[model samples]
Target chain A: IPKEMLRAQTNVILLNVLKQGDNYVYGIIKQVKEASNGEMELNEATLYTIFKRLEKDGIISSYWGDESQGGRRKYYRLTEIGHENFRLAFESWSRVDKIIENLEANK
Target chain B: IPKEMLRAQTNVILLNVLKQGDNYVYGIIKQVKEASNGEMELNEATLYTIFKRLEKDGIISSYWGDESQGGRRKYYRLTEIGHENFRLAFESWSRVDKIIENLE
Candidate 1:
């Protein structure tokens, strides 16, 4: 997949995983991979960039786990805004999907 | 839909439309609207931007129609490169669709 296409949908993917429950970086990556049946693999750099952006946007909030839990790892959970954004993104994707289907079928 | 999302796919959409046959600004807009069942309405500015970008990228080429045909208007047709780019864009969208499905 093109990086642009991956980046375009990363926010929503992360939000969807986070909405399931709280998770750290690697955990979130694992969840996505599992959900996609290994079709989606997120690199550390891209995930971190999205993390920072989502944090700053108030779409997600993070906290560091206890030191006893195999080293301190930051965990993330969706904020109210994140849920709303995910809903909007979902709707947008539906519209996009419809457009693509229409274009392709007519062709 | 977000303008960002629309802009992301505009190049591919234009390429798809042009791959069928040559079309001008209004004609392209009409075709897209028709294909999408009036769901996609491309304003002049966005269409113009894509036209310039496509022309610069050599994905499409444009020429003026005969002056007698309701005053000369520019028309665009896909080049060889445009066809290749359309194929690539189609694959990219498929990947994106899969990702969205998994995520949703």
Candidate 2:
């Protein structure tokens, strides 16, 4: 897949998840798989790489979750800046949705 | 606010719009504005810049639309590669959506 497409959409998904408050890495991967109907195939390394990128941007912040079961999970949460970005992403998708609707209507 | 977030989300928005079939630059801007609820503030130059990037990646291909009312519009359409990328994006969003649901 083209990096451009993957990069953008993945950001939205990442931010959207973070907006829910806080989440651990494994939880995020699981949600992503389920959300994509088990189509998203992300290995741990790739997921961590993106997490680092997002962290560097300050779009998401992470802290350690409780080690109730075993090792502590690194939890991530969206920043205010991230929410603003989500708004932009939603707007972008809405625009595309309109075009798709128009085309289907014509057909 | 953050460049990383904007870069990723904007790409998804661009591809989602292109998936509709074919669209022109202006039309895309208009749709983006609407989708973002009039929050996306994109100047023509910036919009074109992203377009060029997407084009370079081969996720999208463009041609001239009819010049019925005025000058011809450059129409963009997604390639098969683009569709595969879209699936990834959708999956990504779905995962995030689940997290949000779990949180809230």
Candidate 3:
């Protein structure tokens, strides 16, 4: 819906899949879509662009998958920095949850 | 986990909440944590930093909420550009999903 919301949601889905060891580009996309109930939408070029952004920031590292059927897939994995980020984001989300709960309770 | 994955996951959670009309920063965080089963982690400064970034890119716009209880909360909402991006991202994710299913 909102751009900030989209970006934030995208990160959550991406990290969740990566945490589960979805290291390949294709794998990450698949897991994210499944996690989102097939709502996550991205194109190959856009995915690569996002991948490069994350890679450049050392959020993820990548390697070429084993050649198969005349092709090799590029595999990507999260780094320690990424894990730390997840932890921080989760904590912040918790606080927000509390606030929302309080508001709902008052309502 | 990995930084890229973390970033990607965060976006999904964020957009999902926004899609459901969570327009406030606090609301976005609340929904994200709940959606993630209380696993999302972010601090105030970092949250604000991200808010600013997304705002700069026109992914979101904000307004000051009505003053209440001696304070006001800043509200944020998504824009048309953001929705377009989400659609593209979802489509891409679908293709990736098919490929993964085939591999598995």
Best by TM-score: 1
Q: Which regions of candidate 2 fall more than 4 Å away from where they truly are? A: A99-107, B1-104
State the lDDT of candidate 1 residue by residue for B64-103, as single tens digits: 9889857878999889988887787777556655655665
Q: How close is candidate 3 to the true structure, as a TM-score?
A: 0.50
Better of 2 and 3 by lDDT: 2
Q: Compute DockQ for each candidate against the true complex.
A: 0.36, 0.26, 0.09
Model 1 chain A worst lDDT run, 10 consecutive residues: A1-10
Candidate 1, residue A33: Cα displacement in angstroms equals 4.8
Candidate 3: tens digits of C-alpha lDDT, residues B29-66: 66555544565654456567766877898987888887
By lDDT, who's the top model here? 1
The digit string of per-residue lDDT tens for model 1 on A36-107 reads 778778888888988888789888899988888478998888899888877877775566656656766666
* Span of 10 residues, lowest total lDDT, candidate 2 chain B: B95-104
Looking at every candidate separately, what fraction of the true A–B Cα contacts under 8 Å does it contain?
0.26, 0.28, 0.02
Please state how well chain A of candidate 1 matches the true chain A, as a TM-score.
Answer: 0.80
Candidate 3 - CAPRI tier? incorrect
Best by DockQ: 1
lDDT sort, best first? 1, 2, 3
Q: Which tens-of-lDDT digit does each residue in A19-107 have in candidate 2?
A: 76578778878877776667664467766877898778776788888898889888888788867766766665555445445534543
Q: Go through the candidates in order and give the C-alpha RMSD of each one to the true structure.
A: 3.4, 5.1, 8.0
